[PDB]
Design a protein around this ligand. Structure first.
Ligand SMILES: [Cu+2]
Ligand SMILES: [Cu+2]
Ligand SMILES: [Cu+2]
Ligand SMILES: [Cu+2]
Ligand SMILES: [Cu+2]
Lengths: 95, 95, 95, 95
């Protein structure tokens, strides 16, 4: 019940089209659900503070309409990107 | 006091090289300073939740070493990007 | 007989979705046929090392389902791209 | 010999800046060397015929001036990209 949408145009290098919301603010214990609403595949990969991929939450490929969930059980700031479009970086802030 | 750095390599079309911190968390009334530490010009433009440019804070072009400041007097979430590199989007979260 | 397909998703700014095959190997004198199977317009332009368009084989805009043909009568390695999606660069290798 | 250059500007989504040569033709048993001549980090990851990353030859990050090598012992066509810039796709063709 806390959603992040990957919107139409997320595949492009435009200002518009970033993950929605770009920083999801949630309390500990929340399930986060990403949905791909774009016209191309995407995925969700946790990255470290400097933007290097790490193994905290890592989705399979998501076709249009596919979903990925992760439960955030610890306070902190979590960045993520998409391995197909690494410049698309979002955050989940758990407090 | 509440600094954001545009790092060397922010011009890169990839994840690493994003604004540091990507979400700056500050209390209301704080003066925020962006510094361009990159090797090319950048700017800072406030955008809304859909990525449309708005006139809340808008910098001139910043050369290497240049700084831009904005005082955030109100509570809220403020997205911004660079019109030269629109894929580079960050936030200031004011509480 | 010697075909290159522009697949659905070629407009994507990423690896997957590239021309199929990305390097077409053909004997000299062969007629090569490109087909646009994607859902947006594309074109086929021969380019130089600097990604500037050169005059050798240069298609009109290709609508979905449209085809473009060129007869390759000289041996050599021929780069081409799409001016709408210049990151999509392929080869025809004639021997 | 068997060198591929990652040129200046390869980080961008432009026509210019593709791997040089885009297709490297070599005989079996050849050591191939990639060199990063760009102003940002790159890496080299083998991908399958459709452009999905696979474990076959996979470099660490390459800073400016760094090299990566792989010995190609088997005939075939081997695509690769960069995990930082997935749209930059090249080939090694082994005969
Ligand atoms: Cu993506
Ligand atoms: Cu999980
Ligand atoms: Cu910029
Ligand atoms: Cu195109
Ligand atoms: Cu790269």
């Amino acid at each position: 019940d806390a959603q992040i949408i990957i919107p139409n145009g997320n595949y492009d290098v435009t200002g518009a089209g970033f993950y929605s919301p770009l920083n999801l603010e949630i309390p500990v214990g929340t399930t986060v659900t990403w949905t791909n609403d774009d016209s191309v595949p995407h995925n969700i990969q946790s990255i470290d503070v400097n933007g290097k991929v790490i193994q905290l939450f890592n989705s399979p490929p998501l076709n249009t309409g596919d979903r990925f969930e992760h439960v955030f059980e610890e306070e902190g700031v979590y960045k993520y990107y998409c391995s197909f479009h690494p410049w698309r970086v979002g955050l989940v802030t758990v407090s």
